[PDB]
Amino acid sequence: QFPQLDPATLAAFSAAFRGELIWPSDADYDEARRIWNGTIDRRPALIARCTSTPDVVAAVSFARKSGLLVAVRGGGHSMAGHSVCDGGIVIDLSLMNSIKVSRRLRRARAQGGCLLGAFDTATQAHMLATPAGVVSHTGLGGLVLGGGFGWLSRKYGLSIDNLTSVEIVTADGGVLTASDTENPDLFWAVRGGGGNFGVVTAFEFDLHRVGPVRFASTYYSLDEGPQVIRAWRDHMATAPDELTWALYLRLAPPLPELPADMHGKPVICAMSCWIGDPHEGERQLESILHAGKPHGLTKATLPYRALQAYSFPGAVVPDRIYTKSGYLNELSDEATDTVLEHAADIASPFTQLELLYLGGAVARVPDDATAYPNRQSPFVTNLAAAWMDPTEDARHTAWAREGYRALAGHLSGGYVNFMNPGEADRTREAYGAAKFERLQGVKAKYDPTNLFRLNQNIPP
Amino acid sequence: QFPQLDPATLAAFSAAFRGELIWPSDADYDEARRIWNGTIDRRPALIARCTSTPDVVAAVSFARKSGLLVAVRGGGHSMAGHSVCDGGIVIDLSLMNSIKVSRRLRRARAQGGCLLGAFDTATQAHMLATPAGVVSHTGLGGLVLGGGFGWLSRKYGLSIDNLTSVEIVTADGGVLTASDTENPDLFWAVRGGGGNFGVVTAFEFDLHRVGPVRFASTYYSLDEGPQVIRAWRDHMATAPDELTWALYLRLAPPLPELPADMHGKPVICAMSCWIGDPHEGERQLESILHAGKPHGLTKATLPYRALQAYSFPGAVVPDRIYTKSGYLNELSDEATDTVLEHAADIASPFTQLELLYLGGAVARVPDDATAYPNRQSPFVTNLAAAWMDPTEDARHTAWAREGYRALAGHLSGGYVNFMNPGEADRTREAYGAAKFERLQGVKAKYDPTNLFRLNQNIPPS
Ligand SMILES: Cc1cc2nc3c(=O)[nH]c(=O)nc-3n(C[C@H](O)[C@H](O)[C@H](O)COP(=O)(O)OP(=O)(O)OC[C@H]3O[C@@H](n4cnc5c(N)ncnc54)[C@H](O)[C@@H]3O)c2cc1C
Ligand SMILES: Cc1cc2nc3c(=O)[nH]c(=O)nc-3n(C[C@H](O)[C@H](O)[C@H](O)COP(=O)(O)OP(=O)(O)OC[C@H]3O[C@@H](n4cnc5c(N)ncnc54)[C@H](O)[C@@H]3O)c2cc1C
Ligand SMILES: C[C@H](O)CC(=O)CC(=O)CC(=O)c1ccccc1
Ligand SMILES: C[C@H](O)CC(=O)CC(=O)CC(=O)c1ccccc1
C-alpha cells in the first residue's frame, strides 16, 4: 500500500485530475476503503474519487502507466469484494452521481457512480422509472453491467434491456460511445459483461411511466413452506407480467405487525407488488395472500420511489456477508424440500434464503441479444448469509456452502452479480461456452492486457 | 434573451467552465427552463449547468461582468418561480448531486444541487438521516437555506439546526467557508436567509441514527372535521417529540383502500409517524387513529428512506401551482370552522389545504440563534392549489386567496419557502423587524450590489 510511484507519471496525473485523492495516511482512508461486504479488508495505494469523465481518463492512464491493479467502485455493493484492492488504485466513481431526465423524450442519462435511490428520485420527479435493483443504496454501475433486475423487471426487463447507450473509458484511455449503432460489439458485451471492458461514466436509459403501485408483504410460518412455495411456483408459471412475488426465508423480524410469539422464528416473508393499476393490483394481491395462513400483513399503495426504498425495514446494517446463488429451470418438490431443510437451519437474524421468479419480459428477449445469460431460467435462489461478528465467519459461510451443494443438481448458471469472493472459477459456467467465447473476443479488442480484472473476469 | 455579450468575456467564461451551457436555440432549452411551478414561463439568455465549485465561481463572475440577472437553481421547487429568469443566466446546480457520508463522524457533505432523495439514499446506507422536506425530488439547496422542515423535525429540528458549515461562492466570486467559527455572521444569515448571500456549493450536516419508523395514513369524512381537527390540535399540544401528525384536506384519491363512495369528495387525509421504537410507535399511532372514523387506513413499518419517498401516491404530477401560507400561534375553534368551509370548496384533485404542527425541537432553539423566524408558532397552514389546465388558473388562485383572507386575522409570519410569485412584499413581515435589519447588514457586507435578488429578497442596508 506504500508503493514507489514515478514522479513524472504522478505529476501528469495531478495536473489532469480535478477530483479528490485519498492516501493511506489520510484520516478518511480506513472509512473510504471499506465496502458493503465487511469481510473484505484491503488497503489500496490510492483512492481517486473521480468527478468527471476526464478524471476517469486520467486515473485509468495513471494506473496503466504505473502498473497499479485497478479496482473500479460505483456503489461498493460487490458480493465478491471487487471494488477495493490491496496495493492498487481504486477508481472510485461515487461522487459522479448526476442524472439528467428528459420528460419529453422519456430518457435519463446517469453517471456511472449513481446510487439507485438517486436515479429513482430523479426519474420519479416525472412519474418515470426504469428497472433496477430493490435496495436503494446499491450502485447503478455494477448492477446494470451485470444485467440488473428488480420490481419492474417482469414487466419491463433487466436494466440492460432499457439501456440505449453508454459512455465508456477503455483501458488505453480512450472515451467511446457504445450503442446499437456505435461500437455495437462493445455495446453487446457491456450489457451483462460487467466492468471487464472499461469504466462506464454515463448510462442512458429509456424510461416508463410508473404511477402508484399496490404492494403487500406478509409472513407465513416456515411449517407451511411446502404449500406456500408450491402455491408460489404454480402461480408464477402463468402469472401476468404485472405481478412480482418473491419469497424470503428468514427469522421473523421483531416488527410490531408480527405477533411477539413469532419474532426470531423461521418464517417465509412474501413480498408482492402489481406493476399497473392499483385497483387491479388489490384484486391480484388478495388472490395470492392466502398461500399459507398470513401474519403481519402490510398492504399499501406506494409511489414507485417508495417501493424502491422499502427493502427492507431493519434496525441494523449487517457488516459481513456471504452469498451462494444459482438459477433453476424448474423448482421440483425435492428441491423445495431441500430449501426448506436448509432454511430451518438459519440461526441468525440477517440471513435470508431468497426465492425469486423472473421470466416475464426478461425471458422474451432472445438469449443472444445481450451478454446476460440464463434469461430462460425463471427461478433464482440466493443463500444470502449476513451477520456481524467475525468470529462467526466459518459458521455462516458453511451454512451457505452446504445449502448450495445440496441444491447443486437442480441449479444452473449463476448471476455474476451474486458471486462471492471465492467464485472466480464460476465465470465460464455462468455465461456458458458460446457467450464466454464471444465475450473473450470483445475483451481481446477493448482490454487486451486485462487491465480491468477486479470483476467476474473474462480473460481476452 | 439574445443580449449581445462581450466575446472575450464569454470565451474566458467558456475556457474556465467545465459544465454544460444551454442556449435558447438548443433542442433542450424549453425543457431545461421549465421549473416545478409550471405557471412560470420565462426565457433565460443562458442556462449554465455547473459541475463543480469552480464552475459556480466562473458563472457568478461571468454574470457580474456581463450584467446578467442571476437565477440560481437547486431542485427547481420555488413556489415563487425564483429559479428561472427572463433574459438573464440560470446558474443551474442540478448536476452537483454528490454526497459524502462519514458513518464514524455521523456527518454528510452534500453539494448544493442535491435532491432530497439522493441525500436520504446516501445517509440511509448507514441508517443515518437528518431532517429535510417530505417530497423526495425537492432540492436540498433552496429548502435548507429557508430553514427546512419535515418528518424528523419535531425530534431533530430544522435542516438548518443540523447544519455545521457551508462552502459558499459570493457575489465578488470569492469562495468562503461559513460556520460557527468562520464568518459566523454569514453562517447565521444563510440558516434561513435564502439564496441572498451567495451560491452554496456544499452543505455539511450532523446526522442521527434513524431506524425503521411506524407510519399510518387514514382519511376522515369532512362531516367529522371539527372533531378530528380539534383532537389533532389538542393532542399535539402535549405530544412526545417522537410523534408527527399532519392533516391534509383534499379530494379523496381514487385508491383501492378507500371506498368508491368517497373518491373525489373532500376528506381529511391524516399522515402520522413515530420517530423512535416501532412497537412504541404502534401504540402511539393506534391511540390517535380514532380521532374520527378512519377509512382507507394504511399502517406500515418503513425504513426512513421509504417514509421520505412516500409523499404522495398519485397518478399525475400537477403542472401548475399556487400557494398561500402562514403560521398560527393557536388554532381556535373559529379558525377551524374557517379551514373546513374553504376545504369543502376544493375543486382540483391535486389541491390540498395542509395543517402542520411543528414545535418540539424546532421551538427549543433560541429565536435569535438563526435567521429562521416563527420558531415559536407551532401551526402552519398552506392553501396549496395545484392543477393542470391554464384556463383554470384564475379559479384555483382565487380559491387559495379567499381562504388566506378568511384566515388572515389568525395568521402571523410566513415561511419564505412557501411564498408565491406575488409575495415579494411579504419579506419584512415574514422575518420581523430585528431579523430583517440584521439580514440587511449581512447583505450590505456580502452582496452589497444585490447580485442575488431572485429569492425572498433582502436588499442591502
Ligand atoms: C443489499 C444489496 C442488494 C442487491 N439487490 C440486487 C437486486 O435487487 N438486483 C440486482 O440485479 N442486483 C442486486 N444486488 C447485486 C448487485 O447488482 C451487485 O452487487 C453490483 O455489482 C453492485 O454494483 P455496485 O456499483 O454497487 O458495486 P461495486 O462493488 O462498486 O462494483 C461491482 C462491480 O462493477 C464494477 N463497476 C461498478 N461501477 C462500474 C462502472 N460504472 N463502470 C465499470 N465498472 C463498474 C466494479 O469494478 C465491480 O466489478 C444487490 C447488492 C446488494 C449489496
Ligand atoms: C412538492 C414540494 C414539496 C415541498 N415540501 C416541503 C417540506 O416538506 N418542507 C419544507 O421545508 N419545504 C418544502 N417545500 C418548499 C421548498 O423548501 C422550497 O420550494 C425550496 O425553495 C425548494 O428548493 P429548491 O432548490 O428545490 O428550489 P429552487 O427553485 O431551485 O430554489 C429556491 C430558492 O433557493 C435558491 N437556491 C437553491 N439552491 C441554492 C444554492 N445551492 N445556493 C444558493 N441559493 C440556492 C434559489 O435561488 C431560489 O431563490 C416543498 C416544495 C415542493 C415544490
Ligand atoms: C441482499 C441480498 O444479498 C440480495 C438481494 O437483495 C437481491 C434480491 O433480493 C432479489 C431481487 O433483486 C428481486 C427481484 C425481483 C423481485 C424481488 C426481488
Ligand atoms: C406540496 C406542497 O406544496 C407543500 C408540502 O407538501 C409541504 C409539507 O407538507 C410540509 C412538511 O414539510 C411536513 C412536515 C412535517 C410533517 C408533514 C409535512
Quote the cell numbers at residue B332. Answer: 381556535
What span, in angstroms and rounded, lies between the C-alpha atoms of A353 and A338?
11
Phi, psi (degrees; rounded to nearest 5) at B251: -70, 140
Interchain proximity B127–A317, CB inside 8 Å: yes
Contact in structure between B102 and A107 (CB atoms under 8 Å) = no
Quote the cell numbers at residue A278. Answer: 392499483
- Resolution of the coordinates in A? 1.8
DSSP E strand boundaries for A43-196: 46-49, 70-73, 89-92, 99-102, 107-111, 128-129, 163-169, 175-179
Q: Which of A31, A255, A312 is facing B103, going by the closest CB pair?
A: A31
* Structural domain boundaries in chain A: 19-97, 98-209+420-447, 210-419
What span, in angstroms and rounded, lies between the C-alpha atoms of A318 and A20?
28
Contact in structure between A440 and A460 (CB atoms under 8 Å) = yes
DSSP E strand boundaries for B172-275: 175-179, 199-206, 208-209, 213-221, 243-251, 266-274
What span, in angstroms and rounded, lies between the C-alpha atoms of B87 and B65?
15
Phi, psi (degrees; rounded to nearest 5) at A152: -85, 0
Whether A179 has its CB under 8 Å from any CB of chain B: the answer is no
Residue pointed to by grid coordinates 392533516:
B247
In chain B the first and final C-alpha atoms are separated, in Å, by 31
Whether B305 has its CB under 8 Å from any CB of chain A: the answer is yes
Which CATH number applies to A19-97: 3.30.43.10, 3.40.50.620, 3.90.950.10, 2.60.40.10?
A: 3.30.43.10
Nearest Cα to Cα of residue A254 among A299, A315, A307, A312: A315
Virtual torsion, Cα B449, B452, B454, B459, nearest 10 deg: -40
Interchain proximity B125–A137, CB inside 8 Å: yes
Quote the cell numbers at residue B132. Answer: 429535510
Instruction: Report which residue type is found at B285.
Output: L
CB atoms closer than 10 angstroms to residue B180? 10
What span, in angstroms and rounded, lies between the C-alpha atoms of B70 and B62?
10
Contact in structure between A386 and A353 (CB atoms under 8 Å) = no
Topology at the third CATH level for domain A210-419: Vanillyl-alcohol Oxidase; Chain A, domain 3 (3.40.462)
Contacting residues of A for B210, CB less than 8 Å apart: none
Helices (H), B3-80: 7-16, 29-32, 53-66
Residue pointed to by grid coordinates 389545504:
B353
Contact in structure between B350 and B396 (CB atoms under 8 Å) = no
Which experimental approach was used here? Answer: X-ray
**Helix axes of A333-343 and A393-407: crossing angle, nearest 10 degrees:** 170
Quote the cell numbers at residue B305. Answer: 428512506
Contact in structure between B233 and B333 (CB atoms under 8 Å) = no
Virtual torsion, Cα A122, A125, A131, A134, nearest 10 deg: 80
What span, in angstroms and rounded, lies between the C-alpha atoms of A244 and A250?
19
Question: Which of B305, B307, B388 to substitute to test the interface with A, most A CBs within 10 Å?
Answer: B305
Phi, psi (degrees; rounded to nearest 5) at A216: -140, 145
Quote the cell numbers at residue B190. Answer: 444563510
The domains spanning B98-209+420-447 and B210-419 adopt the same CATH topology: no
Helices (H), B92-245: 116-124, 140-146, 153-156, 184-190, 225-236
What span, in angstroms and rounded, lies between the C-alpha atoms of A191 and A160?
5
Contact in structure between A1 and A24 (CB atoms under 8 Å) = yes
Contact in structure between A247 and A270 (CB atoms under 8 Å) = yes
Interchain proximity B118–A125, CB inside 8 Å: no
| Architecture of the domain spanning A98-209+420-447 | 2-Layer Sandwich (3.30)
CB atoms closer than 10 angstroms to residue A34? 17
Q: Are strands A46-49 and A89-92 parallel, antiparallel or unpaired?
A: parallel
B77 CB-near residues (< 8 Å, 6+ apart)? B35, B36, B83, B137, B138, B139, B142, B143
Instruction: Report which residue type is found at A267.
Output: V
Question: Which of B17, B30, B115, B121 to substitute to test the interface with A, most A CBs within 10 Å?
Answer: B121
Residue pointed to by grid coordinates 417508495:
A306
Torsion sign across C-alpha atoms A349, A383, A404, A229: positive
Nearest Cα to Cα of residue B418 among B151, B150, B146: B146
> Which strand (E) or helix (H) includes residue B71?
strand B70-73
Instruction: Report which residue type is found at B308.
Output: Q
> Which strand (E) or helix (H) includes residue B21?
strand B20-22
